[PDB]
Design a protein. Structure first.
Lengths: 264, 264, 264, 264
């Protein structure tokens, strides 16, 4: 008999009954991923800094029968992250999936960007990934059931850009932090750690879309073999795949969500 | 309201009712992927050179209610591939998914490997990918409904190896052929083209596993953050993901199925 | 005392008295590299298919005191390559450096490109690299003095492009063939094998430069952090570096000559 | 006539009369690069934190007719870096080449590595690269004559490793910071910015070389197509190449100094 089971294939993409902790939950990708986990049957614990926006999401999701909760925390603040994970464990008993979607950018040329401004991006966008991953991984180790970590980086983790010495250092570094975390955790504890590297969202560029003096929209479109800019919903499939049994062998990968921008 | 639909999330990983054409169908990965597509509800058209082995698979799958058929063809032979696609279209009406799993290798140092031996690997392992992709892409264009192509390459498409001047040229080339095919087809025709880059299967190395003189098994294990060698079933999730609506934005990618070998 | 010698530093970039065999010697990069090796004091053996163009180069170089010779050969023809290397050995006693610059392209979409047209690119652009490298490496092994091989690929060895299923397969494959050849030859025989991955030459695009309907020139310029397209002379430094003692530790590398196109 | 000049070829690798500022000058690679620039005729300005070790190097180099000087500075401290560059400008009139060789590592698994310990590596190894590059680039801009920046990263900038969540984030980030700096500076100001990615030095592993319980030495040797571990002198050629006219077109590159570790 061929070495594949029907039970495996039918349920491999499931996240049903799993507890998914989503950071940057009020952001463009974070709110979409949080709802997608909910629609897929996971218990959703949303975190971010804006309580009013988290409350609005919790009300919308609960009206559709999604089991969800939220915790306010600055992801770069070690004490707040620890308390937030404790609140998730108190609510749901465990953490099975972590989706890291928070971040920050402020593009500026190196000559005009102070060391403090560069450090601000690194703390908000890079240190915060270490803090959240370290504390959630420790919780997954404590549980002894393995787990899944999905870090949203950027196609900027592999390609530089003018004005991006902060963001590219942060994302370039996070991709390697993910591969090193897989080396630290996957074999011993059954914790898969992967990143997704998306291109830009259409909605991020619509503001200057009608400006003939701007080349930004067309510079991206010339470099998108898929033929269009991304929507957050375009990455829910990859995120859920990397959060399910279907990706049990996959670890330390930096997954291409660029629509071909990285390979053309 | 958050921009993601429940109907999208519930059905995004489906391949139900789709016609999946699988090359190298009698091989270790090919038979597993063929059955996985069948268990997932796709109509499966298997192709390979060994009729007796294809007949055995068809009998096994039909006994489990899988709708499948086969066609004998040498994938490097345009005329045989063209006739094989015609037989798939006659049986099922169309081709929606293509999974390319066939191949050949015969490692040998460049000094001892004749130009004819190198060419034999290139024809069997590389030219055959161009032939199958070109003819199936043309059928998908003719249909006007888009489609999915998944080419199985190898982690050897990105890392060289002693004795692999044939296989590494073929796989390294196929990864770029996939990115270029996405540039040719995805925007205009809605045909996504991606590759998966697997590490070795545990069963491929079981022969010399007990020989202390061989370092092969341990060479790979030291370089596998996941902590074990692969089974064909470990790649069914990625292959089905890349064959479904869940990956509609993903094209021209060379997906890391190495278990961390590529990133450590 | 610091572990570096003055004699080493003063002479590390030298190719003086070395025999450099350059393929595609009559082409834009080939003629420039051949003359640069000559100006740097190497004995230059030029090869290509056009005898009149090789004779013109030999006359120009000899008028400037360069020790050079030529041999006519189709680089994909195993018998002609063997005879050409024999003629170089008869003239100069040995081969120390090989620079592979020949090639062919004919861009065409996969749907319109016949299997025979794809194969034509592969034979002219990829098989020919295997033939030349195998025979020159065998000669270097026979000599027992090590050697240097520099293969000119393209930035297309790492990035796909519409119409390039032939060229990208050939260059993508050649980069991996180089890494595998380093695995086969460098430790045992002291033969370093590396590739250089250039961007396009300014002169290749000047024809359609005044056509407003063409985006080619600007598509490249937007993606060149260096701020201009390349001239063949821009790659002589990297080629000579990879042909000298200064790069003795460097092997199996695919060197970025893209002017930042690969990293932005 | 072939488009290459003899005067260009004869002098392209020269750093004679150029002012080379070397950070981490007392380290294994820093002292070797500092002396190599000196032997090549550059004016050498060495910086580091250990005054006694800088004084010993200055005395050794002056005894061999090298024009050199030193300045004590912590490279992560903007005020000290600014004062150090002022002292280099006062001594030599300008800065033409910058070689960044300093760094820090303390491997530790993520579960046992505090956020403060991770931050310590990031400040010492990553923030310090931003500080030095920003201040030296500003000095090169002020001069208006262009310049060369060579950042020494590691093969760890592209491959993760157990215990390296700090170092891999720092090096992975620095490679992207270099590509982004090239986008910010090369076209407008003629400042090329590149990195070199070395493998480990033989001397770094000699301690546990005789311990059968340690796999480290053999783990690297199995992955070195060149056939041996590196010496600092093995990277002087690449560093001087990237500091000379021979590499004028090369910018934003992350150069492979791994001996094939990256490509096998």
């Amino acid at each position: 008999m061929v070495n594949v089971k029907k039970e495996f294939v039918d349920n491999m993409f499931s996240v049903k009954g799993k507890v998914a902790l989503v950071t940057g939950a009020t952001g463009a990708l974070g709110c979409v991923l949080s709802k997608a986990y909910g629609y897929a049957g996971a218990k959703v614990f949303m975190t971010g800094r804006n309580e009013k926006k988290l409350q609005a999401l919790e009300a919308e999701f609960k009206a559709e029968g999604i089991d969800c909760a939220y915790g306010v925390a600055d992801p770069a603040d070690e004490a707040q992250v620890d308390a937030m994970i404790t609140a998730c464990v108190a609510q749901y008993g465990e953490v099975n999936i972590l989706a890291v979607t928070h971040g920050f950018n402020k593009p500026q040329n190196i000559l005009e960007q102070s060391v403090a401004d560069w450090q601000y991006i690194m703390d908000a966008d890079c240190k915060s990934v270490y803090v959240v991953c370290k504390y959630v991984a420790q919780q997954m180790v404590d549980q002894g059931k393995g787990g899944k970590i999905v870090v949203v980086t950027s196609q900027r983790s592999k390609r530089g850009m003018a004005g991006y010495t902060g963001y590219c250092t942060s994302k370039g570094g996070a991709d390697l932090m993910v591969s090193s975390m897989a080396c630290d955790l996957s074999a011993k504890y059954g914790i898969n750690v992967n990143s997704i590297c998306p291109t830009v969202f259409r909605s991020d560029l619509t503001e200057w879309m009608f400006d003939p003096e701007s080349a930004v929209y067309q510079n991206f479109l010339k470099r998108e073999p898929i033929g269009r800019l991304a929507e957050p919903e375009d990455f829910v499939g990859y995120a859920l795949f990397l959060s399910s049994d279907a990706s049990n062998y996959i670890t330390g990968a930096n997954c291409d969500c660029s629509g071909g921008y990285l390979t053309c």
